[PDB]
Ligand binder design. Structure first.
Ligand code: FES
Ligand SMILES: [K+]
Ligand SMILES: [K+]
Ligand SMILES: [K+]
Ligand SMILES: [K+]
Ligand SMILES: [Mg+2]
Ligand SMILES: [Mg+2]
Ligand SMILES: [Mg+2]
Ligand SMILES: [Mg+2]
Ligand SMILES: [Mg+2]
Ligand SMILES: [Mg+2]
Ligand SMILES: [Mg+2]
Ligand SMILES: [Mg+2]
Ligand SMILES: [Mg+2]
Ligand SMILES: [Mg+2]
Ligand SMILES: [Mg+2]
Ligand SMILES: [Mg+2]
Ligand SMILES: [Mg+2]
Ligand SMILES: [Mg+2]
Ligand SMILES: [Mg+2]
Ligand SMILES: [Mg+2]
Ligand SMILES: [Mg+2]
Ligand SMILES: [Mg+2]
Lengths: 43, 38, 122, 222, 94, 51, 18
RNA sequence: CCCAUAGUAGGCCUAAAAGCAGCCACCAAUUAAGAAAGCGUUCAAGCUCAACACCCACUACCUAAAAAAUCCCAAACAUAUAA
RNA sequence: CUCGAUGUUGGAUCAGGACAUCCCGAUGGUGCAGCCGCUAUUAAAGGUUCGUUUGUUCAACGAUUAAAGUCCUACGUGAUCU
């Protein structure tokens, strides 16, 4: 039981992917670098 | 592929899922619960 | 359709709070950027691949110095999500002909003109 | 000594001559001949028309996009007219009659062979649109019950609202955005193409700002 | 491990980067004579020289550019004055 | 006092820096004398060589 | 297998004028 | 939770309409109780609700499921200082 | 996917499994007096007929039965048969 129809990560019905805590922290870490890039490009 | 407007809630690209997770509303949390003060 | 992105000019207007956070001086802008690629160009549009080449950032984690001028900044803004930008700091001034061979770029962004590889007597 | 308070008065209120909802036709009187593209954007994003109260003080507010066919109009009309008090209540349509033609191919046919014949007409609705507006010498508590019953039976998320509850809804959303403690917001990231995120976002997201996904509206998104 | 901490002390995130652990000579002759410079250190030395020279070239070019524009503005302002002088007016005003 | 009133780990009190500076000098002197008097046998070393 | 209809729109195949 | 008398079955229409099929009014007795909000009766009776009294209920006012065919499916764990 | 072949209906043989239960068990409701029923919860251990016509799956009909259940298994099963 518990089959995903067709291929897992494409199509209409897909296997749900969830966002882990460290995935969030990774994204926020790069958001901080880009925010600082904005600043040093302002002068 | 599926069209931009669907009857079901379309699955998001994983990068977009992460974007949503990182931009969720965070309410202002008081230092001391207001019910614990006169 | 996916296209090039026009960035609003307000994005590059620093507020007084920003100056406190990052420590830059709006009245004494830094002359030179230190630019390092920290993100692959795979899975990015071709125009972003070509600007990375133009800026000499093909190899990741390799600092490059660039002039802090509008034309250069225009390129940097296209690839701002792929790089880290820091101001070049010159605590002992510019290198001279005598000390050309004794420079080191530290992780703080300071280019020192003496590199003794010795502990500080202080 | 239980403390009584002044009761609201509706002496200035005036009930129109025709209080009940009028009949909505299945199809326009003059049938449309030219077949039209699907144009799903007509139910996508925020509504710009019929977002404010006009004559009445109560209404059903759309919280999603969808198409209203004649069957829906009959449910709305019969339920509201049967439940409302004609003497003290009046109801008006805030949506046009079905006007967009929907084509269907004959059963069992393969793909191809041209577009299908027109089958029925629908009314596109966007989130934030008032669908039916009620007024008269009544309180929201009186009409909320049957208005909520009708809203539940619509093909999109909907909720009965009043002038007061609608304004409070908008004020609460504005307050949440002002007092939000998350330094990162969908608008800031998307409009600046931070992380190159626009490669996974639609151009519409610059104005939708993460609150709309397909035809669905997310009220808790800031 | 420790990359972020090293960066906080002004050191390279990787201990294989700049510093005495990497750059100092690995060995010397037992008698005392120093060893020929290591090949990796020679490359790093040359690499740093080009970077410093580029830093000086970019700076000097930017200074000359600012001085050239400042001299262009000064000339433009001076030119306006010369055009003012002309023959003395006559007529109703005299 | 409850199960969560205080942290699970025990409290650690580090030595007084002034008193410890004196203790450190004693330890260094003791080990130094072992070197002068040759109170060691086989030695080992960790050396960085060729990366 | 059902017998299908045909499209009634002819023409419209002109190329762009540049 | 507690408690409910009365002009009066208001008139009208109706075979009958008594708070409660419809139409009009919706005034008044008692400190307090709608010419009646929900049931009920062929019409009445009958049971509640809004009243008074008593007196701290010291109310949340956001909603809410599941079924398939060979055999569930890593093992596990709420507690030691973000790395 | 397979045409340098994955044999194509119904039946026979042997059946494996699902429960959305036809019968048997245990319960709630009923416009449940009783006898019979109707509806819902729980239950898959065990059981679920023989014949006339039709290649038929079905369907009709005769006689029964506590009941003659609904489905999946390459419309289960032809290197077992027809
Ligand atoms: S925890 Fe302080 S009032 Fe209850
Ligand atoms: K799929
Ligand atoms: K609905
Ligand atoms: K009556
Ligand atoms: K084949
Ligand atoms: Mg698969
Ligand atoms: Mg395809
Ligand atoms: Mg598409
Ligand atoms: Mg054309
Ligand atoms: Mg063409
Ligand atoms: Mg009375
Ligand atoms: Mg009478
Ligand atoms: Mg009466
Ligand atoms: Mg009656
Ligand atoms: Mg009274
Ligand atoms: Mg009575
Ligand atoms: Mg009461
Ligand atoms: Mg073969
Ligand atoms: Mg079996
Ligand atoms: Mg069951
Ligand atoms: Mg078969
Ligand atoms: Mg054979
Ligand atoms: Mg076989």
């Amino acid at each position: 039981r518990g089959r995903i129809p067709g291929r897992q990560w494409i199509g209409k019905h897909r296997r749900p992917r969830f966002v882990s805590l460290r995935a969030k922290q990774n994204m926020i870490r790069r958001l901080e670098i880009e925010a600082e890039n904005h600043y040093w490009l302002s002068m | 592929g599926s069209k931009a407007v669907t009857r079901h809630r379309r699955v998001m690209h994983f990068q977009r899922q992460k974007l949503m997770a990182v931009t969720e509303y965070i309410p202002p949390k008081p230092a001391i619960h207001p019910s614990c003060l006169p | 359709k996916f296209t090039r992105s026009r960035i609003p000019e307000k994005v590059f207007q620093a507020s007084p709070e920003d100056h406190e956070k990052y420590g830059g001086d709006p009245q004494n802008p830094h002359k030179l950027h230190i630019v390092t690629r920290i993100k692959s160009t795979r899975r990015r549009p071709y125009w972003e691949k070509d600007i990375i080449k133009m800026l000499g950032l093909e190899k990741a984690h390799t600092p490059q110095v660039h002039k802090n001028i509008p034309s250069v900044n225009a390129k940097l803004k296209v690839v701002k999500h792929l790089i880290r930008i820091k101001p070049l700091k010159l605590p002992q001034g510019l290198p001279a002909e005598e000390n050309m061979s004794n420079t080191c770029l530290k992780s703080t962004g300071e280019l020192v003109v003496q590199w003794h590889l010795k502990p500080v007597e202080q | 000594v239980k403390t009584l308070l002044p009761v609201p008065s509706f002496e200035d209120v005036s009930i129109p001559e025709k209080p009940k909802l009028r009949f909505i036709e299945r199809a326009p009187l003059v049938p449309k001949v030219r077949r039209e593209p699907k144009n799903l954007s007509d139910i996508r994003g925020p509504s710009t028309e019929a977002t404010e109260f006009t004559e009445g003080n109560f209404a059903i507010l759309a919280l999603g996009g969808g198409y209203l066919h004649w069957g829906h109009f009959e449910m709305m009309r019969l339920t509201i007219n049967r439940s409302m008090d004609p003497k003290n209540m009046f109801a008006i349509w805030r949506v046009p009659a079905p006007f967009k033609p929907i084509t269907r191919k004959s059963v069992g046919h393969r793909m191809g062979g041209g577009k299908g014949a027109i089958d029925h007409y629908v009314t596109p609705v966007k989130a934030g649109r008032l669908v039916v507006e009620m007024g008269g010498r009544c309180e929201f508590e009186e009409v909320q019950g049957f208005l909520d019953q009708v809203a539940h039976k619509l093909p999109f998320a909907a909720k009965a609202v009043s002038r007061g509850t609608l304004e409070k809804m908008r004020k609460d959303q504005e307050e949440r955005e002002r007092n939000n403690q998350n330094p990162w917001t969908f608008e800031r990231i998307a409009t600046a193409n931070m992380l190159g995120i626009r490669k996974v976002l639609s151009p519409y997201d610059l104005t939708h700002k993460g609150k709309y996904w397909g035809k669905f509206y997310m009220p808790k998104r800031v | 491990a420790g990359g972020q901490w090293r960066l906080q002390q002004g050191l390279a995130a990787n201990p294989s980067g700049y510093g005495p652990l990497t750059e100092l000579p690995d060995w010397s002759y037992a008698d005392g004579r120093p060893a020929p410079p290591m090949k990796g250190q020679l490359r790093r030395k040359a690499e740093r020289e080009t970077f410093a020279r580029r830093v000086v070239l970019l700076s000097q070019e930017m200074d000359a550019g600012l001085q050239a524009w400042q001299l262009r503005q000064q000339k433009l302002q001076e030119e306006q004055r010369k055009q003012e002088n002309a023959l003395k007016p006559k007529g109703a005003s005299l | 006092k409850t199960s969560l009133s205080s942290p699970p780990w025990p409290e650690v009190v580090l030595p007084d820096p002034v008193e410890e500076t004196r203790h450190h000098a004693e330890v260094v002197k003791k080990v130094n004398e072992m070197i002068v008097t040759g109170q060691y046998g086989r030695l080992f070393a960790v050396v960085h060589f060729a990366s | 297998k059902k017998s299908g209809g045909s499209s009634k729109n002819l023409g419209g195949k002109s190329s762009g004028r540049r």
